[PDB]
Structure formats: structure tokens, C-alpha cells
Design a protein around this nucleic acid. Structure first.
Ligand SMILES: [Cl-]
Ligand SMILES: [Cl-]
Ligand SMILES: [Mg+2]
Ligand SMILES: [Mg+2]
Ligand SMILES: [Mg+2]
Ligand SMILES: [Mg+2]
Ligand SMILES: [Mg+2]
Ligand SMILES: [Mg+2]
Ligand SMILES: [Mg+2]
Ligand SMILES: [Mg+2]
Ligand code: NA
Ligand code: NA
Ligand code: NA
Ligand code: NA
Ligand code: NA
Ligand SMILES: [Sr+2]
Ligand SMILES: [Sr+2]
Ligand SMILES: [Sr+2]
Ligand SMILES: [Sr+2]
Ligand SMILES: [Sr+2]
Ligand SMILES: [Sr+2]
Ligand SMILES: [Sr+2]
Ligand SMILES: [Sr+2]
Ligand SMILES: [Sr+2]
Lengths: 154, 95, 186, 160, 140
RNA sequence: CCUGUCAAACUCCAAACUUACAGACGCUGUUUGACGCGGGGAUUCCGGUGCGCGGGGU
RNA sequence: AGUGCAAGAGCAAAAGAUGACUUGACAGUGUUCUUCCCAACGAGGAACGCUGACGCGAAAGCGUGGUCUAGCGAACCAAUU
RNA sequence: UUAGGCGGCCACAGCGGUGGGGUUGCCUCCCGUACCCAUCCCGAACACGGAAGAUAAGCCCACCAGCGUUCCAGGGAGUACUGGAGUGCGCGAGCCUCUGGGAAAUCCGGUUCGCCGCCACC
């Protein structure tokens, strides 16, 4: 289970790529989604490779994020353990964050929006002109490096 | 193109690969198909008759009946639907 | 043989056993094939249905097993040919076959030959095969009269192994009669 | 005409003589030089001239450079010296020139060039250790008469 | 083995290539059967523009007709070494050609599942000479 | 035999890739009716630039 | 190799050659595609059917011209059935 | 299939070669022209009638890999080329990094001397 995060805007972006992003339930820069690792789901993120930032997050981090940037299918209400408990098949955020990673269920299935609308990275990202291996912030990340992004985007 | 006939730019698709030269096997040229069946369209350079317009190679249509011994195959060119008259010689079962 | 560009014929064309041109023109009918094939001492007649992996034979008849009902004569002549054809046609009717087309392979469509004599037999057996009566031999020659009159020019018996001197085209009638018979273990 | 006009590979490969006509004869005298009877293996030292950038070299520049290279070898090793140089390239690419503005712009045939990818051996001489210096000088003259920068690489013989 | 291998006269062709015929008769007499016309292909500058037109006439003598003819035909010619084909065949002279072969040549002449004769069963020039020499004559 | 080179109008080979049909996942439609069909009204048929692949021309 | 002619393509118990017989280069009406990728547009073209009549073959079957892609033309006017 | 008929795929089957096989069984070569039929001339072939002889042919069986071919391994080669991205480099033609794909020739060792279906038959 990876975490997609749009870092490059829509302008000048090849159409078939923005459509894939849209299919991956992401329509804005800094928006993020939790995608499983399947043959199909993989082909997509690979096509989105250059305009996104992705990787697998540590559960701790996923919990801090779900805590902050998660929302219901419709609503202004904040998702907390107490909220999680009453709507999902879980008891707390951790239980949820766990199932998502083990790929047991999805955000929709649990009455949650598929998009984690994040805040601009605190201190800025490593750049959107080069990949991670080149010192940039695009493409695939490390389970540590992805957390560094996500957390900066609390 | 420099001319707009049916055989324009058809050197490749309508030629036989060296080792495939000469007359073709009758088994397929007499094959039976059922209505609703999916079939692949490709001309047999060796077989002169029962051909569809070259432009339709690589298609995968649905047989919907026959005309004489030849078949009526539905396909969708771009967005336009067309019924194609073709003999089993140029047809292959999908899967 | 020579290189990558060389064209090697279909197996059955190298062997020179199947005329694929006459084969395709034969399959177009959609009807089964009454395969009429000879041999020096024998004559056979099969019934072929098209199949996924190859031709299916639903009924046949060899001139050899033409003895099982009472045949002491040779097995590669006109009477034998007609009879073998009649036998297979009878077994053919049994399986469900009601029509076929004449497949003579590489044998020539010579007027009054053995293959047409074979065809005639299966038709007489109740099968429906597009023919041309006049191309067939006359009843007497089918019976074996042409050979009976040849033995008339004796001085030396025609048949080596004992059967009889002047032979018997009656044996033909005797056997044909036996086939039309309702009983007979086909 | 200047080599600026044809030094780059910017047109399609135009070599099919069965369609092209009036193709000018190759100025190149010969590709086989030295003692074209003795083998390359019969020599301890083998030195080639490597082209550092992919280009098209016209037969007149091919001949000119080769000439001034072999003229030195003949000069320094005698007309029948113990060497043998080569030129493994042949000018297959036909050139044109439109010589009326841009109407009916297809040019008429004016010459032949030889395509050479970077890192390729335009020349390859074969000599003995003692003569391995006149060869390095013959190539230092040869590379001055062609468009790209060249490199003199020694294939055999560490004798130094 | 020697039996199903001992050679024989398969056919004896005798023709008179002219170029414009009337000579047919002499063969019909000496051979004992009917002759046949001989056409041609490609235009010839020696007034032979008409493609398909009577130029000569041959006769294919097989079995007895051939042997009885050879009893007289053979003596009338001095045989030579170089006069032999690699498949054991010879022409001499009017022309006379003898086509020799081993017992089962029907395998390559029939219609059904025909086959070409293996090089081993193929008659030899030397082995041919011996066969012929073994019948009222000499050699080289 | 050995030795040195080529091909827009060559090919024993041969991608990436484009492409028909189908299933799965995704997204989407069944009060926002998608897909599709019928009808009314157009404008428009001087384009341009970047990038990739081009063809001609120094 | 040949197959009427550009080029590209098809064909070997043939689509090529020889021989014989034949004149289907037939009458009539259509389906589909092409002309015009997609995507509307005429004449023209082709493949695939049906009905009538014919040629050939033992028969299956082949023949709506010449193996395939060029050799074509509106109304009006004129002549003909 | 101790030798047969009809096929499918249509060289893994081709080319070339070795060795083995047939009493009333088979296929053949073989034997022969009264007939059906036959040759612009030949019962050669086609067609018809027949078993004196043979297993040399063919054919069936077993095997050889020199050539051709099919597939596999390692080598070449993640090279050539390439779909996506880059305020990366280069005067420039062009190159490079990340990402997702990925040859060809050729070398070396293997495999391939057809596989399969229906019917028939000691
Ligand atoms: Cl069509
Ligand atoms: Cl047979
Ligand atoms: Mg909301
Ligand atoms: Mg700041
Ligand atoms: Mg910055
Ligand atoms: Mg092409
Ligand atoms: Mg007017
Ligand atoms: Mg008139
Ligand atoms: Mg033997
Ligand atoms: Mg720059
Ligand atoms: Na074929
Ligand atoms: Na004549
Ligand atoms: Na315009
Ligand atoms: Na029309
Ligand atoms: Na033998
Ligand atoms: Sr250019
Ligand atoms: Sr002007
Ligand atoms: Sr230079
Ligand atoms: Sr394209
Ligand atoms: Sr035609
Ligand atoms: Sr005989
Ligand atoms: Sr610059
Ligand atoms: Sr410059
Ligand atoms: Sr891979």
C-alpha cells in the first residue's frame, strides 16, 4: 500500500496522466490518496511517476495524518477515534490505519473521502524538477522519506 | 498517399511471410462460426476472394449471420458501426 | 531445406497423397466424404466427417472383411468394389449418415472404373451421393461378367488358388443379396 | 562548397542508386594501402584514427586527409615500407544542392559523403614498434583535414 | 536381391530432329509402331519464328518393340565410355537413346504417393556398361 | 576461402509503441438519466508556439 | 518462369503451359464495404447473396470477364429497344 | 498401425546418411492386356485382371546432426533502440539522470531426424 501525493499542477500536464490522477481520486496539487499495490493500481502510479510523490508510510505517520487530514464522505466533522469507532468497522485510528496498510479495506468502504487534502510541506519539499535519487521530491520514496513529506504536510 | 485505391500502403499486411508462401490449409477456409461469436479479421495473402477492405485487419467483430457461405461480421470503425462481408478464410476465433 | 526462405510443402503434399485443391472444393458441400481408395489386392471405402483435430471416420468397409459374410473370391476387382461400397453404405445408414460426396483422391475419374463402381454400391445401399449414372459401368461388368468371359479363354485357369474354373459372378449376386438382407451382423 | 552544408546527419539515408542518378565519381583513390598482401596480424602495432563526433565526410575530404596521411607514411617509411593502412568507410550517402526560389526545391546530385558514428575507426594502420611514430604523425595530419576531432588509439603493442 | 536389382530396358527413343517432318515414315517402318510430331519454343533467327510447329518426330519403344529394334540398332554403332550418362543412359548417332533402370521404377513414375529413386538404387554408368556388354557386344 | 563497407523506395531478424475485442480494478451513470437517439441555433474552414518524430532547403 | 501494360502483391497435382469443349464478358434484383478512415456526399468500383437461363465437370464445384489494386462522367439534348 | 485409409498443425516435419523388416496377413515393387479406360507414340502413365517371384525400391521401425529449422541456457547485453519526466551538460549536431520497457548479429552449451486426431487390422 502506497501513498500518492500530487506535487505538480495540471497545467501543461498530458491529459491521459491527469485522467489517471483523477481516476486515482486526486484532483488538486497537495491532495493525497492511499493506493493498494496491485498489477493494475501499479500501472497507474507509474504513469503518474513524474508528477507525484509516493511510497509506503509508517503506521504511526498514517495515524497522525488520518487524524488531521481525513474527512467523512460529506462533512466538516473531524475524524478521531471516537468518530472512527461509531462509523467504521474499527475502534480507533490505529486499528483503521492498520487495515488500510494490510489492505483489508478502503477509505470509501469506511464512509471516508478517498482524498487526504494535505497542507503545503513545512520548510518546503526537496524540489519538483528532479526525482528522489537526484535530490528532488518526485517519483518513489523511502518509508522514511515519505513520512518526512506527509508529516511536513500535516 | 499518392493514390487512394484499396491497396494503398498494403504492401506489409497483404504480403506472405516467405515460409508461408503458396496455397493455404482448407480446414480454416471452411470453418463454421456461430452468430454472436467473436472473430479476428486478417486477410490470407494466399486467398484472393472473400476479402474485406484491407483497412479492417486486426479487428475483432461479432458474427451476426451469413450471406451464402460468407459471413456478415459487425465491427465498429472509430465510432461508426459497419457490417463486413467476409469468408472464414480470413477469420479466426477469439481466445 | 536450403535456408530460412525455403518453402516446404504441407506434409500430405510431399507424400503426394492429398490433392488439397480437390479437397477444399470437396469440403464446400458441407456433406461427409465417401472416400474411395484402392490397393493392389484390395479396395476400401470410408465415410469422413470434418473434425477439430482431423477427419472423423464414422463408417468404412475393406474388401478383406468382405469375406465375413461368405466371400471366397479375390478382393481387388469390380464385383468386390461394388460390394465393399454397398457394405459401408449400409453401416453408414446405421450411424445416421444419409448423404455424402465422392472423394476419389488421386484416382482418375475414368468411365466405368472401380471407384465409380464403389460409389454406385453405397448409393444402392441407400445413401445420397450426387452422381452421373452413365459414367458408371454397366450392371454386367459390375457383376463380374468381363472377367468371366476372360476365363472363357481358358487353356490355363485364371485363378491360382482353387475357387473354380469359369468363376462365379453369381457369388456376387449371392453376396449382394446377403447385404440387402435385414439381418446380417454389420 | 563548405562542409557546414553536409557535416551533420540531418537527412534520411539516401543511398539507393536504383533511383538516384548522375552520382559523381568517388575522388578516393584507394582504401587498401601499404603492402596489401601481408596480414594485420603480421604486425605488432595496430593504430586507428577514431572520430569523436558522428558526422558525414565527403569523398574529397576523405581523399584529402587519407592522402596527406599516406603521403607521410610513404615519405617516412619509403614507397615500399613495412606498413599497411586502411580506410574502412565508403561514401554511400548521396548529396544534393538546390542550385527559382523554393519552388521545385529538390536539389540535383553533387557528391557522396560517408557516415561515421562517433567512436568509429576511420583509419587503421599496421606497423612495427620502430615505425609507430610516423603513423601517429600521419594521423595527426589526417585528422586536420576532416570535420570532427579525432583520437589516436593504439589497439596492439604497449611497447614504449 | 540380385533379382530385384538386375536392370532392364525401360524405353528406347528414336527421333530425327529436322527444323521444318516427311521423314516420319522411315521410323514407322524400322520401329514397328506410330511416331509423333515435335514442336518447339522461342523464336529462332534461322527461319523458325512459328513457335509450335512440326520440327521432328520421336518414337518411344518399350518392352519387346525396343529389344527387337536394338538387335539391329546396337551393332550399327560403336559404343564409347564418355557416351554414358550418370544415371546409366546413353545416346548414339538419326538418334537412338536407351533409358535403363532397376526393377521398381514405377515408384517414381506413378501418380499416388510417388517418390524419387534413392541415389543407391540409381543405376551407375559403370554398372550400366556391364549390363549392356553382357548382351552381344563390347565397350569403350 | 580470406578481407573492407551500405540501403526512404532491402529484410533471415526485430523492439519501445500504437491499435481491435474481452474480463478485472479504477472512475463514472440509473432524483445531477450516463451511453444513445431525434430535432432547433450556431460559430468555424487566414492560425500560431513549445516539445517529440518527421519530409524539403546551406 | 509465366501470368497483356506502373508498382506492389497472389499462384506450382495452379491462378502458370498444352489440348478439348465452351462464350458467365448472361438476364433480373439485392446485401455490404468502398468511393468519402473516423464522419455527411454523386457517378464509378469491389466482395457477398437471391431468382431465371446457360457452359463445363463423374461430382463436389467452378464461371456475374482477363489473379488483385488504374482504363472513368451529371442533367439537358440526340439516337436506339 | 509386423508395413493400412482419412486428416490436423504445416521444416520440431527439410537436406543428407546408417542399420533392421515381411509364407497363405498388409503396402508395395511385381505379373499381364479379354474386357472399362488409356496414350497428338508408347498397358510407360492412366485403366482393368491377376499372385510366379522379391523385401533390393517405396513404405513401416530403429538411429546419426554435417546443412536447414524450432525451442532453451549462459555470453553478448539491460548493450542498441525506446514510452514518461528534468531550470541536467554541450556553441552546436547531440548527450546525460530518473522512470517504465527492451532487442539484433554473433559465440557457447543443449533440443529438433516431427507431434496429434479419427477409423481399420494379430
Ligand atoms: Cl468490407
Ligand atoms: Cl487409393
Ligand atoms: Mg467533503
Ligand atoms: Mg518559508
Ligand atoms: Mg525550489
Ligand atoms: Mg510500412
Ligand atoms: Mg445544356
Ligand atoms: Mg442509337
Ligand atoms: Mg535392405
Ligand atoms: Mg544549452
Ligand atoms: Na499458406
Ligand atoms: Na501436331
Ligand atoms: Na484552415
Ligand atoms: Na455507389
Ligand atoms: Na528393400
Ligand atoms: Sr533536415
Ligand atoms: Sr519571384
Ligand atoms: Sr578536426
Ligand atoms: Sr503510428
Ligand atoms: Sr477474379
Ligand atoms: Sr508391366
Ligand atoms: Sr546556445
Ligand atoms: Sr558552429
Ligand atoms: Sr525485466
Amino acid at each position: 500500500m502506497h501513498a500518492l501525493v500530487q506535487l505538480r499542477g495540471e497545467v501543461n500536464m498530458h491529459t491521459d496522466i491527469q485522467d489517471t490522477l483523477e481516476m486515482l481520486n486526486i484532483h488538486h496539487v497537495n491532495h493525497c490518496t492511499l493506493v493498494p499495490e496491485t498489477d493494475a493500481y501499479r500501472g497507474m502510479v507509474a504513469k503518474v511517476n513524474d508528477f507525484v510523490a509516493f511510497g509506503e508510510p509508517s503506521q504511526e505517520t498514517l495515524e497522525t495524518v488520518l487524524a488531521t487530514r481525513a474527512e467523512p464522505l460529506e462533512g466538516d466533522a473531524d475524524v478521531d477515534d471516537e468518530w472512527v469507532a461509531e462509523h467504521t468497522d474499527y475502534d480507533d485510528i490505529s486499528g483503521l490505519a492498520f487495515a488500510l496498510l494490510s489492505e483489508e479495506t478502503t477509505l470509501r468502504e469506511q464512509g471516508l473521502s478517498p482524498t487526504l487534502r494535505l497542507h503545503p510541506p513545512r520548510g518546503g519539499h526537496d524540489g519538483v524538477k528532479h526525482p528522489v535519487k537526484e535530490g528532488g521530491q518526485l517519483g518513489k520514496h523511502d518509508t522514511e522519506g515519505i513520512d518526512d513529506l506527509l508529516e511536513a504536510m500535516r | 498517399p499518392s493514390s487512394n485505391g484499396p491497396l494503398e500502403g498494403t504492401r506489409g499486411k497483404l504480403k506472405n511471410k516467405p515460409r508461408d508462401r503458396g496455397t493455404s490449409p482448407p480446414q480454416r477456409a471452411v470453418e463454421e462460426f456461430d452468430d454472436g461469436e467473436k472473430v479476428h479479421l486478417k486477410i490470407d495473402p494466399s486467398v484472393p476472394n472473400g476479402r474485406f477492405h484491407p483497412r479492417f485487419d486486426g479487428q475483432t467483430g461479432t458474427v451476426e449471420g451469413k450471406q451464402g457461405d460468407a459471413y456478415k461480421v459487425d465491427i465498429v470503425d472509430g465510432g461508426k458501426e459497419k457490417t463486413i462481408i467476409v469468408t472464414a478464410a480470413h477469420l479466426r476465433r477469439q481466445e | 531445406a536450403t535456408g530460412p526462405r525455403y518453402k516446404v510443402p504441407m506434409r500430405r503434399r510431399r507424400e503426394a497423397r492429398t490433392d488439397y485443391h480437390q479437397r477444399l472444393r470437396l469440403l464446400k458441400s458441407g456433406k461427409p466424404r465417401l472416400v474411395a481408395r484402392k490397393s493392389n489386392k484390395h479396395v476400401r471405402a470410408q465415410l469422413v466427417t470434418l473434425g477439430p483435430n482431423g477427419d472423423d471416420t464414422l463408417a468404412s468397409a475393406h474388401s478383406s472383411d468382405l469375406a465375413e459374410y461368405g466371400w471366397e473370391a479375390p478382393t481387388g476387382n469390380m464385383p468386390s468394389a461394388y460390394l465393399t461400397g454397398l457394405l459401408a453404405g449400409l453401416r453408414a445408414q446405421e450411424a445416421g449418415v444419409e448423404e455424402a460426396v465422392l472423394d476419389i483422391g488421386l484416382n482418375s475419374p475414368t468411365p466405368g472404373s472401380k471407384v465409380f463402381a464403389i460409389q454406385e454400391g453405397a448409393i444402392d445401399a441407400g445413401l445420397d451421393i450426387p452422381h452421373n449414372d452413365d459414367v458408371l459401368a454397366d450392371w454386367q461388368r459390375t457383376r463380374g461378367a468381363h472377367i468371366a468371359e476372360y476365363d472363357e479363354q481358358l487353356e490355363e485357369p485364371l485363378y491360382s488358388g482353387d475357387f473354380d474354373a469359369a468363376d462365379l459372378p453369381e457369388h456376387f449376386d449371392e453376396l449382394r443379396e446377403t447385404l440387402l438382407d435385414g439381418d446380417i451382423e454389420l | 562548397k563548405p562542409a557546414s552544408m553536409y557535416r551533420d546527419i540531418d537527412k534520411p539515408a539516401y543511398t539507393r542508386r536504383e533511383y538516384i542518378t548522375g552520382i559523381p565519381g568517388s575522388k578516393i583513390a584507394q582504401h587498401k594501402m601499404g603492402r596489401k598482401q601481408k596480414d594485420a596480424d603480421d604486425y605488432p602495432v595496430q593504430i586507428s584514427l577514431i572520430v569523436e563526433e558522428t558526422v558525414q565526410l565527403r569523398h574529397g575530404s576523405l581523399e584529402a586527409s587519407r592522402l596527406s596521411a599516406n603521403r607521410h607514411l610513404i615519405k617516412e617509411l619509403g614507397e615500399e615500407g613495412d606498413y599497411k593502412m586502411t580506410l574502412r568507410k565508403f561514401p554511400h550517402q548521396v548529396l544534393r544542392e538546390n542550385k527559382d526560389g523554393m519552388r521545385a526545391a529538390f536539389g540535383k546530385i553533387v557528391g557522396t559523403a560517408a557516415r561515421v558514428q562517433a567512436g568509429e575507426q576511420l583509419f587503421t594502420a599496421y606497423c612495427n614498434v620502430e615505425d609507430a611514430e610516423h603513423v601517429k604523425e600521419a594521423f595527426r595530419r589526417a585528422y586536420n583535414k576532416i570535420t570532427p576531432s579525432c583520437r589516436i588509439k593504439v589497439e596492439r603493442g604497449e611497447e614504449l | 536381391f540380385h533379382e530385384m536389382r538386375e536392370p532392364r530396358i525401360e524405353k528406347v527413343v528414336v527421333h530425327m530432329g529436322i527444323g521444318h517432318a516427311n521423314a516420319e515414315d522411315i521410323l514407322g517402318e524400322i520401329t514397328g509402331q506410330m511416331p509423333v510430331r515435335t514442336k518447339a519454343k522461342r523464336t529462332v533467327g534461322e527461319f523458325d519464328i512459328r513457335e509450335g510447329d512440326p520440327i521432328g518426330a520421336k518414337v518411344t519403344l518399350r518392352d519387346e518393340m525396343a529389344e527387337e529394334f536394338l538387335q539391329t540398332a546396337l551393332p550399327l554403332a560403336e559404343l564409347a565410355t564418355s557416351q554414358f550418362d550418370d544415371t546409366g543412359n546413353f545416346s548414339f548417332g538419326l538418334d537412338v537413346t536407351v533409358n535403363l533402370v532397376r526393377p521398381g521404377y514405377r515408384v517414381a513414375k506413378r501418380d499416388k504417393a510417388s517418390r524419387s529413386i534413392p541415389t543407391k538404387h540409381r543405376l551407375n554408368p559403370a554398372d550400366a556398361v556391364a549390363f549392356i556388354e553382357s548382351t552381344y557386344d563390347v565397350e569403350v
